[PDB]
Amino acid sequence: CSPGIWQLDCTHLEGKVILVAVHVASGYIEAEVIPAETGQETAYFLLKLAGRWPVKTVHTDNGSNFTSTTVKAACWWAGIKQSMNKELKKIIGQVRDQAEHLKTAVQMAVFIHNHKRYSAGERIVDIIATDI
């Protein structure tokens, strides 16, 4: 798929919100725990993702998340335009005993996902690099 398409969704676990970004063409994931499922957390997350990877278009399974003027401004500033969450939840449960806070287990699961085999982290760098 195109090298700039990211899918972004907000999932739940242990009463907390986990925002999951997936590089469609590669399966590479960037996920974080946020205190609330607000537009301010989404906007701030998009600004982080955009500055680290080429984010050209963003898709979601809940269009209402991209309706806040806060989120639209972030998409405007970064020049952004408009399944996997169970695989991650699977990994989180496997490593959940190794961590106290859920945020730590989430990052443990992101590490495992991106580096497990080529791997998702290896495909994205090859895709983004090929396009360059």
Ligand X SMILES: Cc1nc2c(c(C)c(C)n2Cc2cnn(C)c2)c(-c2ccc(Cl)cc2)c1[C@H](OC(C)(C)C)C(=O)O
Q: Which residues bind its own copies (CB under 8 A)?
A: 30, 32, 44, 47-48, 50-54, 77-78, 98, 103-104, 107-108, 110-112, 114-115, 121-122, 125-126, 128-129, 132
Which H helix or E strand runs over 29? strand 29-34
Query: Do the beta carbons of residue 13 and residue 102 sit within 8 Å?
Result: yes
* Binding partner at 69 among its own copies, ligand X, none, C-beta below 5 to 8 Å by kind: ligand X
The SS3 of residue 48 is helix
* Smallest distance from ligand X to CB 119, Å: 19
18/22 Cα distance (integer angstroms): 13
* Smallest distance from its own copies to CB 1, Å: 17
* Binding partner at 70 among ligand X, its own copies, none, C-beta below 5 to 8 Å by kind: ligand X
18/72 Cα distance (integer angstroms): 20
Q: In what order do the strands lie in the sheet with 5-13?
A: 29-34, 16-23, 5-13, 57-59
Residues near ligand X (CB under 6 A) are 40, 43-44, 47, 69-70, 73-74, 77, 99-101, 104
* Smallest distance from its own copies to CB 45, Å: 9
* Binding partner at 90 among its own copies, ligand X, none, C-beta below 5 to 8 Å by kind: none
What does DSSP assign to residue 47?
Answer: H
Q: Which is nearer to its own copies, 10 or 88 (CB)?
A: 88
Q: Which is nearer to ligand X, 76 or 118 (CB)?
A: 76
Full DSSP string of 50-70: HHHS---EEE-S-GGGG-SHH
